[PDB]
Design a protein around this ligand. Structure first.
Ligand SMILES: [Cl-]
Length: 372
């Protein structure tokens, strides 16, 4: 892997200080294979009930020394909690913390693209992510899925098996690409929901995605989006056209409901057994009919702002390809990191697994070192 995961722990903060000091000494000027040994040994020896925890995703020994120095300096001034998702560095004394999951939708990297291809590809990566959390015994407090991601969240929560979920994603991708006729698309506004509704009022365009206080996407035909783009310029609101050929999350997707209602209606749906904050309802999932919810998801808005606000969590882990949702979460002042499931680069796997270990949501990092 291009990044190594280095974890360790101790019974308390004083003991962790002593260990990190020894590890720092042992790490200086190690070659890459030597660092791998040091890391693999630490993961084997520091797993189970590990009261005070450190985890970092590092490119080399000098990155490891830099991480240890930050953690040591933090401990030295009496700090008990350092969570730097953008540097893959996590220190927690006296956790566990509450961790929530984020499942991305399209517009996510596909391991513009045809939505019939992208949807099952993305869901296949998210389902691989779920197999990783399962291999780790991860205990998050709940999940949300943005758009297409609601399907992966529901599969994580036990509402639908992996094979039926992937089959649904294929059928949904096919239905959605079958729906539009007249040129249409999406326009992202750097503005809140009320400002977007003011710009869209009377234009024909509607709110498609409510991401946050500074990010709301509207959808409509091309003449409708041009009216909003004109209004946004006059109001001094920044409007960015999206590279998509369909309105999504608007009434122009209604013709897909027949095909999707059929596909979804044959499946063995179960009640979710874990909490899911829905971006269709903006509420906790509480015994909804999943078919009716998936059908109105075609035409209604993505309620990501509302769903993220429900998910009470100190740290969020994105389980899917790319890092779109972690970027949205950080825009809301939340702490988030992505596993970047399916990527060529191990960067996200290392950083995401480090976050899950330091937060106490997984007890054993050894699966990172298996089958190299
Ligand atoms: Cl394992």
């Amino acid at each position: 892997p291009d990044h190594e995961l280095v974890v360790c722990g101790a019974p308390d903060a004083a003991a962790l200080t002593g260990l990190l000091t020894r590890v720092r000494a042992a790490a200086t000027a190690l070659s890459r294979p030597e660092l791998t040994d040091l890391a693999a040994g630490l993961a084997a020896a520091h797993r189970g009930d590990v009261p005070a925890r450190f985890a970092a995703a590092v490119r080399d020994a000098d990155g490891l020394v830099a991480a240890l120095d930050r953690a040591l300096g933090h401990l030295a001034e009496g700090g008990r909690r350092l969570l730097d998702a953008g540097r893959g560095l996590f220190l927690v004394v006296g956790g566990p913390l509450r961790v929530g999951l984020l499942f991305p939708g399209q517009a996510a990297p596909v391991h513009p693209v045809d939505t019939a291809v992208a949807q099952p590809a993305i869901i296949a990566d998210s389902l691989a992510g779920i197999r990783w959390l399962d291999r780790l015994g991860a205990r998050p407090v709940g999940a949300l899925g943005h758009s297409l991601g609601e399907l992966a969240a529901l599969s994580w929560a036990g509402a639908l098996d992996a094979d039926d979920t992937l089959a649904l994603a294929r059928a949904r991708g096919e239905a959605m690409s079958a729906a539009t006729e007249a040129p249409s698309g999406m326009l992202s506004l750097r503005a809140d929901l009320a400002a977007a509704r003011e710009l869209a009022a009377g234009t024909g365009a509607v709110v498609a995605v409510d991401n946050g206080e500074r990010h709301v996407v509207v959808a409509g035909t091309r003449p409708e989006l041009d009216r909003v783009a004109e209004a946004a310029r006059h109001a001094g609101i920044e409007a960015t056209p999206l590279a998509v050929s369909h309105a999504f999350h608007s009434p122009l997707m209604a013709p897909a409901a027949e095909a999707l209602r059929r596909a979804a209606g044959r499946l063995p749906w179960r009640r979710p057994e874990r909490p899911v904050a829905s971006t269709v309802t903006g509420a906790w999932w509480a015994d909804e009919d999943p078919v009716e919810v998936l059908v109105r998801q075609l035409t209604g808005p993505v309620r990501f702002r509302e769903a993220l606000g429900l998910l009470d969590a100190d740290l969020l882990v994105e389980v899917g390809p790319g890092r779109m949702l972690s970027a949205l979460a950080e825009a809301a002042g939340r702490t988030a990191v992505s596993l970047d499931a399916g990527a060529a680069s191990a960067a996200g796997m290392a950083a995401g697994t480090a976050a899950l270990f330091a937060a106490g949501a997984v007890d054993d990092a050894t699966p990172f070192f298996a089958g190299r």
